[PDB]
Each structure stands twice: as C-alpha cells, then as structure tokens.
C-alpha cells in the first residue's frame, strides 16, 4: 500500500544543516505532492513546506531562507534540507502525503525522524539485565543506560514477544546521557523453557545489542 | 496566520461515555478543518476531513461538525484504544496551521500495583556504578510514592522515576524507580528496600533484597 519511510534519527551540531530522505512507495512522486511537517515542544505541529508533482516548492514563511526541498522521481525519494539549526529546531520531522494531489489533508505520514540539535557527542548505550528471582508471574527486563541522543528502540524476542511489555520513557541523567528500562511479565514456569532477549537498537551510534536475561 | 485554540487541554472520561473536542479559530474558515489522532510514539492519524467528512478505516464512533470558528470532534462511546492526543488543522488560509491539541485520559477502577525489585547486575558493577530498580506494574490512578532505604537510611535525591502513558487495553500505568549508587557505596551496605505507597494498597508494600542473597 501507500508508505513513506524516512532516514534514521540523528544528532546535528549547532549551526549545521539537517538532511532527511523520504522514500515513498505505493504511488509515484509525479502524481502527488510531498509535504514536510515538524513537531516541537515549543511550537507543536508546524507545517514546513512541500514539493509538488511538477517539482515546484513552497516554504512556510519563517523557513523560506534556510529550507530546501528536492526529489528524485525515478528513485522515489524526497530530500529535505534545512540550514543553520539551533536548539529550538530540535523536533520530530515528518514527510507526509495528502488524499489528493493538490490538497493538505494528510492521510499518510512517515514514521518521523527525531532530530537533536546539540554540541555533545553520540554515545551508544550499555545494556544490563534485570533478572527475575509473585503468584506464578515473574518480571524481567533490560536496563539501557548512558546513551545519547534519543531515541533507542527495544523489542523482545525479535518482535515475537509483545504481551506484557512496558518500555519506559527515557530520562535525562545529570551526566547529560539518557537511560531507560524495558520490562515484561511472563509465567515463571517458562523461565526454564523459554529464552528472553531484549533487542536494543541505538541508530545514532549504530549500536545494536541483543541481551539474554536469565534468573541469577 | 490563523490561531487555532483547542479546549480543554486535558479531557478525562470513562469508557462508554461520550466526548467532544473543541477547536476554535481566530477568524472564520468555513469548514476547512481536519482532525488528527496521535497515539504514544506514533505519527498523526487522519480522523476527519473538512469538518464532517469520513475517512477510510476510521471507526464510525468518530464524527465532526461545525462551521465558521467553532468546530467539534466527537466520540459517541469511548473505548480504551482511544487514549491519545487530538489535533485540529485549518487550511482555509495559507499557511496551514495546527491547534495545540487535547489530551484524552480514561478513568477506570482502582488497581493496586504489583511491585518487583531488581538488584544491580554483576555486569554493571564492573563499571563502578550500581543501578537498583523498582517496578510498579499495572496500576491506577497515576499517583504513587516510592521510598528507597539502604540499611534503614532514607534515600533522597539519588533516584529517578519514569512512567508509561496509559495502556491502550487495560488503561493502567506502570512505573519504574531507579536508585543509583557508586559501587563502593553499594558494596558497603546490605539491605536494599523500596516501599510503595498507592491508593489501591491498604498498607505500604515493601520489596527488599540482601546484597548477594
């Protein structure tokens, strides 16, 4: 069907430029316009601009100077580029398509790209087990500690395990590095029969870790 | 630019009840308004187009009405899966603008948390830091107290809490309190306990371990 997939999340140094690629499928870029929207803590949902079927571009007023949108119809790719980023440009960026070729009712969205504007350095996380040791139900999880920037993705058993999974929001430590736990409750009788692995992925540092969690 | 004002900031209802979301415009925009849903860690989902028109795949319990400056999104019978934020968008006037959004919370019966405590792993101790974790699982309402004690010494300032958004199935919350100590400090003590206080508990619940069993 109709899909929009964006490039991975990333760190951007202050005053530097942001670059996101939207790869679409289920339709041709020559038939539909592609819009760009961001979502920030300070401004909320904000329409940035659009590239139309014929290649024309419109940019929202406060972005006309630092925004630039190009595309490759053959490769089905839209290229987003914004210059001289500051702290308040930290947001989640989306590419989106409307219901019809000329409109603005955004029926299809990309998964979003979390952009962090910071001078700090990218750092992969360390993953430690939360080993189980009430009433036939045991709890276990993974501690994902000391990474930057957000986000990190955690799944269980390659996606096969979802029931009872809680992945907590990341919290900022005094070191300026993030940390989170991801838990899951399982039958205790399965602890000897089943294997439980948290699949941790930190795209910005290309850190990819599978952590096996066993009772101590 | 058209200013879109959504009210209230937060809406709290029970399942089965009705709910209206208000979106007011700084000037007339006819019926050029669209509505969106945003679930936890998700992208916006188009609910209604042009004030009242239906969208493919959206449950019939969603509907919209209004024209001019006053618009309303409605859910005739809320389900737990409706837990999300809701935004409005105008496109009568360039550039298109969005409202600040309304949060939809669900009420439910009181549910006491299940508490679990996790000692630091031997793998972590090699780095010179100890993270003791306390898990409060599937509870309601959101308010909870976690009190850390190390050899009856009250811990303060050295813990952090994180709370999930409401679950889409049982409408509950889960909490994690993480106590962080140096390896030296952790090895210098024995009894580690977290005491949990919640409305669903008639008494504070304590989960403890002794270092190295």
């Amino acid at each position: 069907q109709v899909q929009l997939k964006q490039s991975g999340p990333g760190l951007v140094q202050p005053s530097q430029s942001l670059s996101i690629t939207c790869t679409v499928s289920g339709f041709s870029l020559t038939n539909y316009g592609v819009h760009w929207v961001r979502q920030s803590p300070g401004k909320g949902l904000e329409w940035l601009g659009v590239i139309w079927s014929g290649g024309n571009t419109d940019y929202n007023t406060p972005f006309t100077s630092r925004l630039s949108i190009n595309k490759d119809n053959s490769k089905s790719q839209v290229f987003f580029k914004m210059n001289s980023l500051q702290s308040n440009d930290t947001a989640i960026y989306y590419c989106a398509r409307a219901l019809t070729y000329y409109d603005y009712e955004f029926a299809y969205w990309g998964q979003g790209t979390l952009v962090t504007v910071s001078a700090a350095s990218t750092k992969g996380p360390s993953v430690f087990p939360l080993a189980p040791s009430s009433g036939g139900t045991a709890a276990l999880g993974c501690l994902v500690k000391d990474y930057f920037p957000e986000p990190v993705t955690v799944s269980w058993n390659s996606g096969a395990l979802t029931s009872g999974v809680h992945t907590f929001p990341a919290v900022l430590q005094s070191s300026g590095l993030y940390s989170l736990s991801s838990v899951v409750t399982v039958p205790s009788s399965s602890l000897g029969t089943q294997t439980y692995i948290c699949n941790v992925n930190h795209k910005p540092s290309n850190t990819k870790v599978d952590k096996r969690v066993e009772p101590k | 630019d058209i200013l879109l004002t959504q009210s209230p900031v937060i809406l709290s209802v029970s399942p089965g009840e009705r709910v209206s979301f208000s979106c007011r415009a700084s000037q007339s925009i006819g019926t050029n308004i669209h509505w969106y849903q945003q679930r936890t860690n998700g992208s916006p989902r188009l609910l209604i187009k042009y004030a009242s028109e239906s969208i493919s795949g959206i449950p019939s319990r969603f509907s919209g009405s209004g024209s001019g400056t006053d618009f309303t999104l409605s859910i005739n019978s809320v389900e737990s899966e409706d837990i999300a934020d809701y935004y409005c968008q105008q496109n009568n006037n360039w550039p298109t603008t969005f409202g600040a959004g309304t949060k939809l919370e669900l009420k439910r019966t009181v549910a006491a948390p299940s508490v679990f405590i996790f000692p630091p792993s031997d793998e972590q101790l090699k780095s010179g830091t100890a993270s003791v974790v306390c898990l409060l699982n599937n509870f309601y309402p959101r308010e909870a107290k976690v009190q850390w004690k190390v050899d009856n010494a009250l811990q303060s300032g050295n813990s952090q809490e994180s709370v999930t958004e409401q679950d889409s199935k049982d409408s509950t919350y889960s909490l994690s309190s993480t106590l962080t100590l140096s390896k030296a400090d952790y090895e210098k003590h024995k009894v580690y306990a977290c005491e949990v206080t919640h409305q669903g508990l008639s008494s504070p619940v304590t989960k403890s371990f002794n270092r190295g069993a």
Binding site: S40, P41, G42, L114, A170 | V9, K103
Partner: peptide, 12 residues
Amino acid sequence: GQFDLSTRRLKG
C-alpha cells in the same frame, strides 16, 4: 501542555 519528544505525547 507541551509536546514531549520522548513519547510523542502531550505532557503539561
């Protein structure tokens, strides 16, 4: 009232 990048939800 503000958008939280960590959860993509409104918080305060």
